[PDB]
């Protein structure tokens, strides 16, 4: 209730033609606009019942950034972005207890451009049921963060990995986790 | 994929000091991670950060009503969005769930918001000085924080180890004993 | 309450 920072962060990426729009409060995402569905997606469902946001204005901004990106690309003699590989960290949100529910978090940090393939590997095999992820989150250094979540039940016989693919990495990066 | 990438970024930043009393607005435009134009509410006009933004700063500041609009953004944009989400962002309080389990004494403080938190170890009454390692504030990305703060100290007899957690969600310190 | 997007500005051309 004293010192805060609210950031409206937008980006547009050629030639992938992927843009994003989100509101950041003190490092947390208030909401983002799903460009496809043209809907406002609150990071917490409860937020959508206390505030609103007309997502159409986010799409108009992304259109303007797409158009400015082409302009800025020409001003720079088509200077491309230099890939920055990510530092990724796997952790849990709660102390681990056998047969007690928990969630695995894969924190992909300090990377650009905002394109990553993230796959959770249970016993070296990809797992998808129950997975979730955040949009790309802005950083003060103008790189990007991203959170991937995997709810699970800890067991002695289950080993987990977080497979991250980024164009800055010469090879895909696995971050391990066991008990 | 081989072809090069081009990234445009826009960040409209609202910096609040003592709530909506001192607000600074920053309209920041980026090519890759390079800021090229910026409106600073302390300056009152767009300024080029690099050469790449020189035509935008000159063009934008000349637009009809532009300077009036941007100079008003601390009220019409920042202070406004502050109050819109105040009840569930600035005022958001989620009390921490604390667990104290063994290692050559691990106080796990999970699920709290905001991230301003103080945890202090107490060995039978006095706060322990050395041996206190802290994992640091880590953000779960879901409006919850967590942190682990450990103590490297030998258990004696039936010495009571207490982890005292002070958090803006609680009126009084939360103490867990081992 | 409604959040207000700050509109993106069209670059000089």
């Amino acid at each position: 209730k004293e010192e805060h920072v609210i950031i409206q962060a937008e980006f547009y990426l050629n030639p992938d033609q992927s843009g994003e729009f989100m509101f950041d409060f003190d490092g947390d995402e208030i909401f983002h606009v799903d460009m496809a569905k043209k809907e406002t997606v609150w990071r917490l469902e409860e937020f959508g019942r206390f505030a609103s946001f007309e997502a159409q204005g986010a799409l108009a901004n992304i259109a303007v950034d797409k158009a400015n990106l082409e302009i800025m690309t020409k001003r720079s003699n088509y200077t491309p972005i230099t890939n920055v590989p990510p530092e990724v960290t796997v952790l849990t949100n709660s102390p681990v207890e056998l047969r007690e529910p928990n969630v695995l978090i894969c924190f992909i940090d300090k990377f650009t451009p905002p394109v990553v393939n993230v796959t959770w590997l249970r016993n070296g095999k990809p797992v998808t049921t129950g997975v979730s992820e955040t949009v790309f989150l802005p950083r003060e250094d103008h790189l990007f963060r991203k959170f991937h979540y995997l709810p699970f039940l800890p067991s002695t016989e289950d080993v987990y990995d977080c497979r991250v693919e980024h164009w800055g990495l010469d090879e895909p990066l696995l971050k391990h986790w066991e008990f | 994929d081989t072809r090069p990438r081009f990234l445009e970024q826009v960040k409209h930043e609202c910096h609040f000091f003592n709530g909506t009393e001192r607000v600074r607005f920053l309209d920041r435009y980026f090519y890759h991670q390079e800021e090229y134009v910026r409106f600073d509410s302390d300056v009152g006009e767009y300024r080029a950060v690099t050469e790449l933004g020189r035509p935008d700063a000159e063009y934008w500041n000349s637009q009809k009503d532009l300077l009036e609009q941007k100079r008003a953004a601390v009220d019409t944009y920042c202070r406004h969005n502050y109050g819109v989400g105040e009840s569930f962002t600035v005022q958001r309080r989620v009390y921490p769930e604390v667990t104290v389990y063994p290692a050559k004494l691990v106080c796990s403080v999970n699920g709290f918001y905001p991230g301003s938190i103080e945890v202090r170890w107490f060995r039978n009454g006095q706060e322990e000085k050395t041996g206190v390692v802290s994992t640091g504030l880590i953000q779960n990305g879901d409006w919850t924080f967590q942190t682990l703060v450990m103590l490297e100290t030998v258990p004696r007899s039936g010495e009571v180890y207490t982890c005292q957690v002070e958090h803006p969600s609680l009126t009084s310190p939360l103490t867990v004993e081992w | 309450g409604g959040y207000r997007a700050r509109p993106a500005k069209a670059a000089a051309t």
């Epitope: 609103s52 259109a63 158009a67 | 637009q63 009809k64 009220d75 019409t76 | 409604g2 959040y3 207000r4």
Partner: T-cell receptor, first 115, second 113 residues
Framework: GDSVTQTEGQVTVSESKSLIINCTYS????????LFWYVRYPGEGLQLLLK?????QKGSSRGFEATYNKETTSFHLQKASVQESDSAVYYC????????????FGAGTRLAVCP | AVFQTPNYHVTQVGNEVSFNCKQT?????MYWYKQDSKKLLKIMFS???????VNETVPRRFSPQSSDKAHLNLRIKSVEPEDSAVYLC?????????????FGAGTRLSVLE
């Protein structure tokens, strides 16, 4: 669903008389409206007289005054002493401050100031 | 300023008409507004940087176009008598609801049977 109701038709006032042009709005689906008075002087195009973009404030121009009163949902237009040059059509307008600019206009009030 | 053209046009039902507008304010956003016979003002279109952002349920008979954010044109493919109106062009700094609209002098269209 969003409407603006203002003094209907023509208002004939002697110069130096005080003037009120009523304007109320119904915007059930708008969190924070913005309120505008636009004026069209004879043989000219529409232009802004004054606006208020903060629910408590009042705006003033050309000796006209209007107070954004969200409590009574009104934006009445007042002038203590109208001059012959105020003869014009006056439009009360509402916008949604959180979405794309779309003016919901009142029907407009023609002021004829008689010397 | 906001320049639009033509100032007056009369044409028969079924014909096509094109109105043109220019604004020199440096604004990103431009608008078509219809002022009908009884002088009621209603938004038709809003364009932001060449992209159509609002279409107030305008009949498909109407085709706006903008290849430059300073320019906004309106073509009515096959006018009907209800199209007789004054069509007002406007611009605003951007699409924010707080912005002042700057209006043009208007195009007086008369569609006759």
């Amino acid at each position: 669903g969003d409407s603006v109701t203002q003094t209907e038709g023509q208002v004939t006032v002697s110069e130096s008389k005080s003037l009120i042009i009523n304007c109320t709005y119904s915007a059930t689906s708008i969190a924070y409206p913005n309120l505008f008075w636009y004026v069209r002087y004879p043989g000219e195009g529409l232009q802004l007289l004054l606006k208020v973009i903060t629910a408590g404030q009042k705006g003033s121009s050309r000796g006209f005054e209007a107070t954004y009163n969200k409590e009574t949902t009104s934006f009445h237009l007042q002038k203590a002493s109208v001059q012959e040059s105020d003869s014009a059509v006056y439009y009360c307008a509402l916008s949604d401050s959180g979405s794309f600019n779309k003016l919901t206009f009142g029907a407009g009030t023609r002021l004829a100031v008689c010397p | 300023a906001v320049f639009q053209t033509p100032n007056y046009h009369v044409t028969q039902v079924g014909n096509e008409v094109s109105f043109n507008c220019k604004q020199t304010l440096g604004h990103d956003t431009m608008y078509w507004y219809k002022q009908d016979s009884k002088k009621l003002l209603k938004i038709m279109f809003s364009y932001n940087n060449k992209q159509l952002i609002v279409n107030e349920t305008v009949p498909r008979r109407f085709s706006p176009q903008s290849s430059d954010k300073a320019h906004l044109n309106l073509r009515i493919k096959s006018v009907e008598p209800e199209d007789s109106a004054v069509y007002l062009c406007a611009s605003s700094l951007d699409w924010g609801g707080q912005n002042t609209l700057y209006f043009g002098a208007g195009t007086r269209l008369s569609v006759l049977e």
